[PDB]
Amino acid sequence: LVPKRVKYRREFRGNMRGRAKGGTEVAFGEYGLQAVEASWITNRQIEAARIAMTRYMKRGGKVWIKIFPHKSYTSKPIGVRMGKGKGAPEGWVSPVKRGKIMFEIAGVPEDVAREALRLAAHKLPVKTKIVKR
Amino acid sequence: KLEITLKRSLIGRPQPQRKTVQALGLGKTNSVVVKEDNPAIRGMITKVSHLVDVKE
Amino acid sequence: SNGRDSESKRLGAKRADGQFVTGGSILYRQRGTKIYPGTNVGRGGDDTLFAKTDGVVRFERMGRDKKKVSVYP
RNA sequence: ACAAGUAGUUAGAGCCCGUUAAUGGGUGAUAGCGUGCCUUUUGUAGAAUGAACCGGCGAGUUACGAUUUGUUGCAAGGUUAA
RNA sequence: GUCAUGGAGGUAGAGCACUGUUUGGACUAGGGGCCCUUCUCGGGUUACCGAAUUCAGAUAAACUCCGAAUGCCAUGUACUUAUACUCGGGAGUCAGACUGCGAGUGAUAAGAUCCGUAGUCGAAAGGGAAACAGCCCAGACCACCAGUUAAGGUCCCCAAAUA
RNA sequence: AAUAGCUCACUGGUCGAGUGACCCCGCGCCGAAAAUGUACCGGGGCUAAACAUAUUACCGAAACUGUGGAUGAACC
RNA sequence: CUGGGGCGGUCGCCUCCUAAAGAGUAACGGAGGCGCCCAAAGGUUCCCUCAGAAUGGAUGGAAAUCAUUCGCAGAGUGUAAAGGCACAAGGGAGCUUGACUGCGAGACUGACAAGUCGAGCAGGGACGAAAGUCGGGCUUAGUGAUCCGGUGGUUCCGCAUGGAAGGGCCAUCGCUCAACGGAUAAAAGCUACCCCGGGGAUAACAGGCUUAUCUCCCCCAAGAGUCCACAUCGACGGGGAGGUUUGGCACCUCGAUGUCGGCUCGUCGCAUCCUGGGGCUGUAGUCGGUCCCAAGGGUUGGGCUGUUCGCCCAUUAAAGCGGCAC
RNA sequence: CUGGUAGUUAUGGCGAGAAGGUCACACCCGUUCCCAUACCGAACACGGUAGUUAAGCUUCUCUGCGCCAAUGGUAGUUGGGGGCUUCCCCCUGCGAGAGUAGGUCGCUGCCGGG
Ligand SMILES: [K+]
Ligand SMILES: [Mg+2]
Ligand SMILES: [Mg+2]
Ligand SMILES: [Mg+2]
Ligand SMILES: [Mg+2]
Ligand SMILES: [Mg+2]
Ligand SMILES: [Mg+2]
Ligand SMILES: [Mg+2]
Ligand SMILES: [Mg+2]
Ligand SMILES: [Mg+2]
Ligand SMILES: [Mg+2]
Ligand SMILES: [Mg+2]
Ligand SMILES: [Mg+2]
Ligand SMILES: [Mg+2]
Ligand SMILES: [Mg+2]
Ligand SMILES: [Mg+2]
Ligand SMILES: [Mg+2]
Ligand SMILES: [Mg+2]
Ligand SMILES: [Mg+2]
Ligand SMILES: [Mg+2]
Ligand SMILES: [Mg+2]
Ligand SMILES: [Mg+2]
Ligand SMILES: [Mg+2]
Ligand SMILES: [Mg+2]
Ligand SMILES: [Mg+2]
Ligand SMILES: [Mg+2]
Ligand SMILES: [Mg+2]
Ligand SMILES: [Mg+2]
Ligand SMILES: [Mg+2]
Ligand SMILES: [Mg+2]
Ligand SMILES: [Mg+2]
Ligand SMILES: [Mg+2]
Ligand SMILES: [Mg+2]
Ligand SMILES: [Mg+2]
Ligand SMILES: [Mg+2]
Ligand SMILES: [Mg+2]
């Protein structure tokens, strides 16, 4: 998951204060994985969690990724002093605020959904809760 | 008519609070001032309620 | 490759609503008409709004989305 | 001569004295508190600087101009220089 | 300084009306796969792409249909308070520090760096935090073998509850 | 080896009161290894002398007050 | 200037974000522009409305021009961006030169130098029937002082007098002075042969903070392991501890904290190399593996490399890994 | 009653439906004259009033679109305090945006004709 293009190549880290303004109620699937505390979810973590959910379902039922990594983040290499302008873009993150349903799934029984989502949750740097519609 | 007593120090407090306490006519800690109960005075007291104590 | 920026142009209101101003007092500095000339007010060549006569400054609404500054003696 | 000490200070027995005689002097068991001085620093007990100790010597002055304050004399005048 | 009244201003939040980023349907265009009486001119399929289109749902320092709290500028015939301005004589300062809050840079590291804003230190002794410039409490004119309180405390070191 | 054999589920009997799931909150547990010496409460030590909620006494500063003294400014 | 210095980059001006809803506000923070252009792209009068899409039409094609309907701007605005603009500031046409001379109450902005806006007055005009508008351009960049020269003008001065020379005043022109408040009219390097004044304001060593990186330990479990996730391993991801690495920072020390390796002497940690005890095992046995407990003692002679390290020879129960100013 | 002309953040607008007409208003007929078209009497201008409410215009109904919009709650937040500090919580005041109940097919002034 990467933005096809971006207005600006570099961008503020921002902050993660408050409950997510939207996407706090499961809207597509039966079951959803709700963030309980805030964190940056990198695209590498979203892919890890997606494959983990999907493999366990065996091409059965649907998986909605409700978060997208819109925000680039930069880094400085090792052995580079501070200054000389902002570092090069490294990757892509989605700042997930608390209460944000990150994944949703439908078309499998509760037990498989609940199992799929715990496998997904173990790849994410955030405390999760499984919630249903 | 209110009796206002400065019960906390102004050391460590922002200018606005010090300036309000001054305009109320309070000096040293435990200074006391008697004022006619107005909306204007009541408004000053609200700004520094954490610094003073108010009687009747 | 960045590092540049112009001097700030100290735009915005220079006299308050309800304030007596002399003729020629700049009321508002602006690019374009954020605010429009009212009665006894003129728009300078750089959109500066100024009092044509002495009087009291009044910022009014002039129709839903627009705004104007007048000077009433 | 069972003690952990920037050396004093506050509290204080005991012992010895007796003054410019006054809620005095010497010493100080024991108890509390306590990180020299200077320089330079955001910050120095500083493991930054300087001084072994004592004594002497050792750093905003004078001239001529400018300006301002104060004082005094005279005042639409005041004042002489060589 | 506060109250009242007026006003400028687009931040927080929020929102998707615009601009960008984006998920899943549905919907037709088409082109490309797929078979093809065909000159791939035209059909029949597609889920391989697709640019619109709507429905639902997200997202923003350099988006805004919206929009606070504060702060700011004024006014008053309001209540408090005691400075303000002008002109002269004399300066010093132009290495700042940390803490809280709001930002950037950094890795949402630094006792980092750079602004904003408040405080303390600097130039502030006292009490607390074992010790501890920058934290908490609080400002030392001098004396007293008087009293009350702050933070912090009250079994012993160690003042106060074995409340 | 396949069979045989032992066992459960699932029932009557005895016995004579409770027993079995799930969710939420408080406080705890593991996860927890560094170099001179205990050494991640200052110490002693504490099962409260810890924590929570509520209460009230006291201690506690060069704060404020008392008493005496010195001193700057302003106004009578 | 500079998160030491050098190298690279930058140096003045304009727009935005950073900027915390007045103004202002830093960084070798994030993005772009400028060093002009225009005789109309200026003034004024009058008149007007754009983009795009649908539909139908010869050359004509997705897209030229024409017609209709729907179209608040999805166009345009010389030129970045922001703020504006459909009573248009956008588009036509007619006449024009106000892209005027003298000024200017009063404001804004500013340390100063400068910069910005300005009603209104007079002269004489342009357009307009008049009202009126017009001292350039929708607004905000497009610039550079003084000194010295050049040209033009002048009821100014003219060193006894008349002139003149020369100066003054008004107008205007000549340097990338761009390091853009411009040291001069005129300016590059090496120093390990160096020297003085200073600085822990500032680097190299060691310490400190930090822990991205590093080492170690874990979570999840897709896989591997003859079947078999978890004997032994473990991708994609996730969470810690440590403070031995590579780094970041510049807080102590520049009136000296004076050095890598080796030698001598050790001491400490345990994340254990050997020896001791145990659990599991893909533990038949032997020989092993792995984890738990365990720091008492032990833990090598050589060759090559300055070498830490490494490679090799030959041993050993073993040839542990770290800390202590490496 | 209708023509003109103002004011008022669209509660005023748009869209849909209906009715009305020498009392104006309008379209409508003409290009001789003034005056027009970067071509066109379409427009602009001028002269007519045979014809008609079809359209604009005026009045009436409608909530489909827009627009306006409480209360309550929430977000945020000044000040004051706490934490387990990517942040979070408590007290006091202020208090959105969204959403909702609901409101709206305008209101108001002058002048002429009726
Ligand atoms: K997780
Ligand atoms: Mg405080
Ligand atoms: Mg700036
Ligand atoms: Mg101009
Ligand atoms: Mg002893
Ligand atoms: Mg003894
Ligand atoms: Mg020493
Ligand atoms: Mg010495
Ligand atoms: Mg003098
Ligand atoms: Mg926001
Ligand atoms: Mg914003
Ligand atoms: Mg610092
Ligand atoms: Mg600060
Ligand atoms: Mg100093
Ligand atoms: Mg102190
Ligand atoms: Mg102490
Ligand atoms: Mg000190
Ligand atoms: Mg007491
Ligand atoms: Mg006691
Ligand atoms: Mg005192
Ligand atoms: Mg450098
Ligand atoms: Mg550095
Ligand atoms: Mg601002
Ligand atoms: Mg002559
Ligand atoms: Mg310069
Ligand atoms: Mg040589
Ligand atoms: Mg030297
Ligand atoms: Mg230093
Ligand atoms: Mg420096
Ligand atoms: Mg170092
Ligand atoms: Mg050291
Ligand atoms: Mg620094
Ligand atoms: Mg020395
Ligand atoms: Mg062990
Ligand atoms: Mg060797
Ligand atoms: Mg060494």
Swiss-Prot record, chain A:
<dbReference type="InterPro" id="IPR047873">
    <property type="entry name" value="Ribosomal_uL16"/>
</dbReference>
<dbReference type="Pfam" id="PF00252">
    <property type="entry name" value="Ribosomal_L16"/>
</dbReference>
<keyword id="KW-0699">rRNA-binding</keyword>
<dbReference type="InterPro" id="IPR036920">
    <property type="entry name" value="Ribosomal_uL16_sf"/>
</dbReference>
<dbReference type="GO" id="GO:0006412">
    <property type="term" value="P:translation"/>
</dbReference>
<comment type="similarity">
    <text>Belongs to the universal ribosomal protein uL16 family.</text>
</comment>
<dbReference type="GO" id="GO:0003735">
    <property type="term" value="F:structural constituent of ribosome"/>
</dbReference>
<keyword id="KW-0820">tRNA-binding</keyword>
<comment type="subunit">
    <text>Part of the 50S ribosomal subunit.</text>
</comment>
<dbReference type="GO" id="GO:0000049">
    <property type="term" value="F:tRNA binding"/>
</dbReference>
<keyword id="KW-0694">RNA-binding</keyword>
<comment type="function">
    <text>Binds 23S rRNA and is also seen to make contacts with the A and possibly P site tRNAs.</text>
</comment>
<dbReference type="InterPro" id="IPR020798">
    <property type="entry name" value="Ribosomal_uL16_CS"/>
</dbReference>
<keyword id="KW-0687">Ribonucleoprotein</keyword>
<dbReference type="InterPro" id="IPR016180">
    <property type="entry name" value="Ribosomal_uL16_dom"/>
</dbReference>
From Swiss-Prot, chain B:
<keyword id="KW-0689">Ribosomal protein</keyword>
<comment type="subunit">
    <text>Part of the 50S ribosomal subunit.</text>
</comment>
<comment type="similarity">
    <text>Belongs to the universal ribosomal protein uL30 family.</text>
</comment>
<keyword id="KW-0687">Ribonucleoprotein</keyword>
<dbReference type="InterPro" id="IPR036919">
    <property type="entry name" value="Ribo_uL30_ferredoxin-like_sf"/>
</dbReference>
<dbReference type="GO" id="GO:0006412">
    <property type="term" value="P:translation"/>
</dbReference>
<protein>
    <recommendedName>
        <fullName>Large ribosomal subunit protein uL30</fullName>
    </recommendedName>
</protein>
<dbReference type="Pfam" id="PF00327">
    <property type="entry name" value="Ribosomal_L30"/>
</dbReference>
<dbReference type="InterPro" id="IPR018038">
    <property type="entry name" value="Ribosomal_uL30_CS"/>
</dbReference>
<dbReference type="InterPro" id="IPR016082">
    <property type="entry name" value="Ribosomal_uL30_ferredoxin-like"/>
</dbReference>
<dbReference type="GO" id="GO:0022625">
    <property type="term" value="C:cytosolic large ribosomal subunit"/>
</dbReference>
<dbReference type="GO" id="GO:0003735">
    <property type="term" value="F:structural constituent of ribosome"/>
</dbReference>
<dbReference type="InterPro" id="IPR005996">
    <property type="entry name" value="Ribosomal_uL30_bac-type"/>
</dbReference>
From Swiss-Prot, chain C:
<feature type="compositionally biased region" description="Basic and acidic residues">
    <location>
        <begin position="4"/>
        <end position="15"/>
    </location>
</feature>
<dbReference type="GO" id="GO:0022625">
    <property type="term" value="C:cytosolic large ribosomal subunit"/>
</dbReference>
<dbReference type="GO" id="GO:0006412">
    <property type="term" value="P:translation"/>
</dbReference>
<dbReference type="GO" id="GO:0003735">
    <property type="term" value="F:structural constituent of ribosome"/>
</dbReference>
<keyword id="KW-0687">Ribonucleoprotein</keyword>
<keyword id="KW-0689">Ribosomal protein</keyword>
<protein>
    <recommendedName>
        <fullName>Large ribosomal subunit protein bL27</fullName>
    </recommendedName>
</protein>
<comment type="similarity">
    <text>Belongs to the bacterial ribosomal protein bL27 family.</text>
</comment>
